[PDB]
Amino acid sequence: PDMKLFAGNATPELAQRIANRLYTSLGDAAVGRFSDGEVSVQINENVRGGDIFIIQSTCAPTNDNLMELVVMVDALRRASAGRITAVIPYFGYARQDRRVRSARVPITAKVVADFLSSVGVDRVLTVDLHAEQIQGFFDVPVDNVFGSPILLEDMLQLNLDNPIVVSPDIGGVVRARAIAKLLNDTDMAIIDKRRPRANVSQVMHIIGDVAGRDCVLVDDMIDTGGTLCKAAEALKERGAKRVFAYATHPIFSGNAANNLRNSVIDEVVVCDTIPLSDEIKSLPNVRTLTLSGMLAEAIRRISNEESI
Template identity: 85%
Template sequence: MKHTPEVHTVPDIKLFAGNATPALAKKIADRLFCKLGDAAVGVFSDGEISVQINENVRGADVFIIQSTCAPTNDNLMELIVMVDALRRASAGRITAVIPYFGYARQDRRVRSARVPITAKVVADFLSSVGVDRVLTCDLHAEQIQGFFDVPVDNVFGSPVLLEDMLSKNLDNPVVVSPDIGGVVRARAIAKLLDDSDLAIIDKRRPRANVAQVMHIIGDVQGRDCIIVDDMIDTGGTLCKAAEALKEHGANRVFAYATHPVFSGNAAKNIAESVIDEVIVTDTIPLNKDIEALEKVTQLSMSAVLAEAIRRVSNEESISAMFKH
């Protein structure tokens, strides 16, 4: 896999940002040597979203940078209304850059339960207002790309996370998948990390956001363990996983995830856990309680996303970014 890319100027695009990830949007703009577009994005007195585009976008290649993280519904509506405003202002092409795609965990009907497939609803919503394509990062389930009627590019946080892993001076590392569903992701990281061994945590989840770690599949005795996942939510599963690894003789335990959701008691769970360090990216801003934790480190996805934007604008390959 290639290292974090160097990005060159793209003078003929326009970048706009909502209120979800302003710091990340600014970093992306800086890497592309351009300024964020002039838009007033706020709320009316009754809470409705207010958007006004204050510059000419006619015929422009426009990218809107907006994660649909908490407050999820507000950020989603901001994105939707911004797309509509830009479409009505005759933007040539609109790409929704969604570093963290909210509602992605509601992607199927488990055992035919009477529940919505909300990821599909959001995909239809975005397509219906005039999004021409979507650029996102580490979708919870890659098949969500098929929910859209427009092209979707799903880039990965692994180049950013891998660089940090390689700087850790790891002792006989083993990459750990926190569940069976994450084995493909963990195996890919293990291959890139000098073809390291793989371990799997077998757990059962009695209800949402609660998980019971059962046992470890693989050898972790006396080894540095790297847990990899796409996101960390309450951190309950992660902390129990780390405890199980330590009980099985693991040396240090590092947790890597692209999306720092960190809801509920996440700060308390992580602070009281045996995890040595939690490493995440900036697809979602950290809340103050998480920022205060010394064991949490945040890396930036700005270089990867900026290069992806440049490639989309220039009609170049996105997959070539991740070949090794």
């Protein structure tokens, strides 16, 4: 069509990869900063009447990456872009989605959604939202792509042992049972989730039969990595052969690398929706699968077929 792909500075390596698989290149645009840390944008080609796609995760630096996106959207609308599709592989601020007990907290995921609407986004792609309801936070079509085909694919690609699937927490049990079923279920497992009272210690206790099983932990994301380490050791305590930790989004804020190299997890496998830091890059535990091909197909299919 008049399909154009632009990329900000959040996920440039990934944006190129989606471009490669769609046999085009990234549109000409200066996206940087002024000397004072305000974002500078200039679209250096005619987008008039074009069906444009902005590939940019809203990941760390989150506000900076968000603002880049937002302001790229403004520039393209004012430049008579035919249609603007925001492709945000990792949707920043996804976790903040409610006001529990009427806490005087923002619902910042909704704020971003508004802000994107306002600036003129016509549609969004994201992979594996923290809660799918965020699709409702928008007033505009949203295709929330699952990165679990490719994970399962890899899980099979190795296979070669037992195995069973494990929810690292209370909240991922939905996500985990799905992948249990999608595999040849069995099996299942859940983690405590057990204070009170004296010592704020964790993990406490698992449920499920992990005798000599070669385990597969799975979650939507990894931040810090304390979540999954404390589940891995607890797994291993029950004779778990090998603990493989799969997830889509590799955040890895605050001391994650140290946790992972101090972890008992044999391999951690993550998708490329967030660029890996030098620390994590320099780690043998970790290996990244690409959603490039997934994302390519999805943004082509807005050619326009459906998904599937």
